[PDB]
Amino acid sequence: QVQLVESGGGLVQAGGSLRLSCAASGFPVAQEIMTWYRQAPGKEREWVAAISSIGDTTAYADSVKGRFTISRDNAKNTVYLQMNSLKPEDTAVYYCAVNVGFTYKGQGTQVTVS
């Protein structure tokens, strides 16, 4: 019954900042691996960033090295996808996935970047 809803979209050019929320529900289990996937129209799955089950160690793709960041807070069972200094080519609808039986992909919120 765990559902992953996403928000935080908008319109902004390069040098912006947004935090996509990977909010989970059902019960507090926000201590697992959250694999982010990005889907620009006309392509297929591409991994963005994953967080260890410990939660203290993680890494992102080399294309977003030093800019992309992820964080989480178990108080309300959500994961924030921190963004800063985004390239104009990152305008896509993202997805966050946690592997508990299924690789659950959320609803997906589009982010518009000029």
Binding site: I33, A50, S52, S53, T57, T58, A59, N99, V100, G101
Partner: protein
């Protein structure tokens, strides 16, 4: 190239002191185990998370002080000498999985 990437000094800087008072070396989100991690025989607890198509090298026998192995969502193959060394030296095993094959 991953074995070439991680030098001994970088791994020793990656060392952690866990709550159980033992030398911890944590590797997360890697294609495989770098063979340089087996050069530091002072390792005590080894944590590996999301390591695909990983085969345990025979070089694991160098880790005399290895006691704890953590396998998080990782299915691993093992060599016969490595299997013997783990059968005769391993103390703790942390298995986190989501499927039988893991």
């Amino acid at each position: 190239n991953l074995n070439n990437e991680w030098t001994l000094d970088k791994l020793r800087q990656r060392l952690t002191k866990n709550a159980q008072d033992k030398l911890e070396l944590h590797l997360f989100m890697l294609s495989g185990i770098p063979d340089t991690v087996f050069d530091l025989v002072e390792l005590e607890v080894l944590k590996l998370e999301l390591i695909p198509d990983v085969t345990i090298p025979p070089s694991i026998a160098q880790l005399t002080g290895l006691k704890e192995l953590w396998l998080y969502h990782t299915a691993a193959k093992i060599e016969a000498p490595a299997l013997a060394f783990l059968r005769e030296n391993l103390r703790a095993l942390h298995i986190k999985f989501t499927d039988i094959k893991e």
